Design a protein around this ligand. Structure first.
Ligand SMILES: O=C1C=CN([C@@H]2O[C@H](CO)[C@@H](O)[C@H]2O)C(=O)C1
Ligand SMILES: O=C1C=CN([C@@H]2O[C@H](CO)[C@@H](O)[C@H]2O)C(=O)C1
Ligand SMILES: O=C1C=CN([C@@H]2O[C@H](CO)[C@@H](O)[C@H]2O)C(=O)C1
Ligand SMILES: O=C1C=CN([C@@H]2O[C@H](CO)[C@@H](O)[C@H]2O)C(=O)C1
Ligand SMILES: [Zn+2]
Ligand SMILES: [Zn+2]
Ligand SMILES: [Zn+2]
Ligand SMILES: [Zn+2]
Lengths: 137, 134, 136, 137
């Protein structure tokens, strides 16, 4: 029913959630990042005794990709155990997503397979970015 | 919000920028928060040798306000030295703002005094929030 | 060292600061108070977020408050929590922020009964990364 | 001459530095993490226009490992272009390392291959950790 790449995205994010390290919130989250060439990098939240030091599924996935040399992203899907709410990315992840482009898709899903799609631009209007430090020239 | 407050808020934000500790970016930023009862808490960005450990002006101000017992905010103004564009809050700050409501105002200014106003909701659509964990 | 008077003021201040803690997620309130060179005290408490990574520790709330007011000379900082049988220790992120402003100052890790362990920033963060590494 | 695992760590850390996304500080850092079963996970610092949203090499590597299901870490090496100074992990990274043990090694290096090794414990004494949050005490 859904395009093949969307199927891959949803399945990978749901699978990625199994590796979540969240003994404090018991709120497992998984993510699957799709690059331009078709490769997928997965991620999950990894908390810390000192809450502020944890990391979200999206950034774990984006950080993995970049460390591997991939900066061209097409889309990223997110999965959680919230059955009645589309899992949405926090502002911090939106900012990191934005560092690598505003024109890519974020699939906010539910366990049943349903989802909402918004671009990074829509998720982060009038975004602060590289231009602020006059880095685009 | 009362224009009397808006002005005091905008000035406080620029004044706060003078304390900025940003020897790495050399991009100082100030912010001023207005609570529901008219009290104003300001803040500035404080960087660190290891970049990830720095903090933004908005959060410095919000964190200050909360530590003083205030959690009901009406607006927050931001000021920087960037001439070409209105200084807007990074996603992390938008998420901290959201933690305490989506209906308040964010004043994104330019050094000359002009600005654009947007609510926390408009800056962080379809947000993740407290209700996700309740 | 630091006079028992300032230490008591720091101690009472951190404990009092802990009352404002915003921590509905962990329900682990923490308070902190730092002493500047001129004797002024600034306090803070942890402030969490629905998305855990966006919270902040009590020490950084205090330090950032101090700096925002123009103070960057610290003599000592005291931390307090509800942990009965354990001295509350600052996390690594806070130690690194403390280090940005010196390594020779004192950190007081306390218990709810007033007992404490004191260590310098240098001792809590040895062979540290710092501003000097970016100059060279 | 160093033990094979040390050579691998040193070399991987050096190679991972090439993927560093650090246009703001222009200070590239690489890290390599050795797990108990011998697998190595690399990472690099990934900055953001808004400085606070950046991530260090050590955590990029640790998060990669955990996302893949590895929590038993044996050692991690760090590399930078700092010629006459062993690159040291920031306090934030030492806290993340500590979440997964205090008794493993950290190799702080220089480009010439020389290094200083300390355990997580020595780099983060009287640390705050998971047990401080245990329900019963
Ligand atoms: O969309 C997202 C919302 C939240 N989280 C993670 O969920 C836990 C609770 O905030 C934390 O571990 C937090 O990082 C994500 O990883 C993604
Ligand atoms: O030494 C300290 C240890 C932890 N914390 C705070 O405690 C909660 C649980 O990690 C989080 O809110 C965390 O920030 C401090 O504020 C100080
Ligand atoms: O809206 C804002 C944009 C950026 N910053 C700060 O500016 C520096 C460059 O990213 C960093 O110190 C960053 O924290 C703020 O304080 C507020
Ligand atoms: O040991 C380390 C010290 C610093 N960093 C990174 O170097 C840049 C300067 O703070 C930042 O990008 C910072 O994250 C590392 O990744 C490792
Ligand atoms: Zn996030
Ligand atoms: Zn910010
Ligand atoms: Zn801390
Ligand atoms: Zn680090």
């Amino acid at each position: 029913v859904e395009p093949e790449h969307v199927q891959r995205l949803l399945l990978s994010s749901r699978e990625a959630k199994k590796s979540a390290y969240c003994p404090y919130s018991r709120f497992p989250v998984g993510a699957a990042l799709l690059t331009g060439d078709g490769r997928i990098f997965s991620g999950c939240n990894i908390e810390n005794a000192c809450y502020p030091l944890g990391v979200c599924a999206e950034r774990t996935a984006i950080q993995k990709a970049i460390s591997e040399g991939y900066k061209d992203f097409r889309a990223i899907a997110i999965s959680s155990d919230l059955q009645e709410e589309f899992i949405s990315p926090c502002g911090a992840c939106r900012q990191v997503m934005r560092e690598f482009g505003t024109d890519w898709a974020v699939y906010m899903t539910k366990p049943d397979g349903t989802f909402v799609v918004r671009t990074v631009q829509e998720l982060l209007p009038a975004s602060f970015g590289p231009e602020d430090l006059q880095k685009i020239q």
